[PDB]
């Protein structure tokens, strides 16, 4: 009763316009913690704000992690900077991951929400696995696989193969197997499957799902292509 759950959703959208995602993510973290279930708008504002925020860090991470490999004093300069970003990145993942397991996921009726939030869970654990190093690695790589699988099976029993969310789930999942779990086999396995299955009802995609559905399948396919 402390605060106003609505003004926050507004601040979150006013932050988006001003293109200040760090601010936007903060406003949505506060909204999720209110307990209520996220409406489709609020749910996007959240997914948008955080993917944009962790996005910058993953990108910066690769860039710096690259020039790191390619003097010692000249490399240590780059090494420590990639560790600064890495933890900055690890922080974002942990807030979202917590926001997911503690509020979002356990509190979502719509199966498409349970697979949407769960896709995210699989996603952020994967970004945490990318920059992840050492032993604890194999452990985070597993949290992702499971979160993704727990979602794949839900959509693979609740959504037409033409539905974007399920297509995306297949898309990100397949990528998890390729890059993360070094398994170029299983990689295309679900890629095609979810793609061919989506083509079957392709003539449906009422003028609504239509776009996003195709956009993803394209990526789903673009992936398959450059994987062979």
């Amino acid at each position: 009763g402390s605060m106003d759950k609505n003004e926050l959703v507004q601040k979150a959208k006013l932050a988006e316009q001003a293109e200040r995602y760090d601010d936007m993510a903060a406003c949505m973290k506060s909204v999720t913690e209110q307990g209520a279930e996220l409406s489709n708008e609020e749910r996007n504002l959240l997914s948008v704000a955080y993917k944009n925020v962790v996005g910058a860090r993953r990108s910066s991470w690769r860039v710096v992690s690259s020039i790191e490999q390619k003097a010692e004093k000249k490399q240590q300069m780059a090494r420590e900077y990639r560790e600064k970003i890495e933890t900055e990145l690890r922080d974002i993942c942990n807030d979202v991951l917590s926001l997911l397991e503690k509020f979002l996921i356990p509190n979502a009726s719509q199966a498409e929400s349970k697979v949407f939030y769960l896709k995210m869970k699989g996603d952020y654990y994967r970004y945490l696995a990318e920059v992840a190093a050492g032993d604890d690695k194999k452990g985070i790589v597993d949290q992702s696989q499971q979160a993704y699988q727990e979602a794949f099976e839900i959509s693979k029993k609740e959504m037409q193969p033409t539905h974007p969310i399920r297509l995306g789930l297949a898309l990100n999942f397949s990528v998890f197997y390729y890059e993360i779990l070094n398994s170029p086999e299983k990689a295309c396995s679900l890629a095609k499957t979810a793609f061919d299955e989506a083509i079957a009802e392709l003539d449906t995609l009422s003028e609504e799902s239509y776009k996003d559905s195709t956009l993803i399948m394209q990526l789903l396919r673009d992936n398959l292509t450059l994987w062979t």
Partner: peptide
Amino acid sequence: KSATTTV
């Protein structure tokens, strides 16, 4: 790298 969801 490989592609993934976006907007």
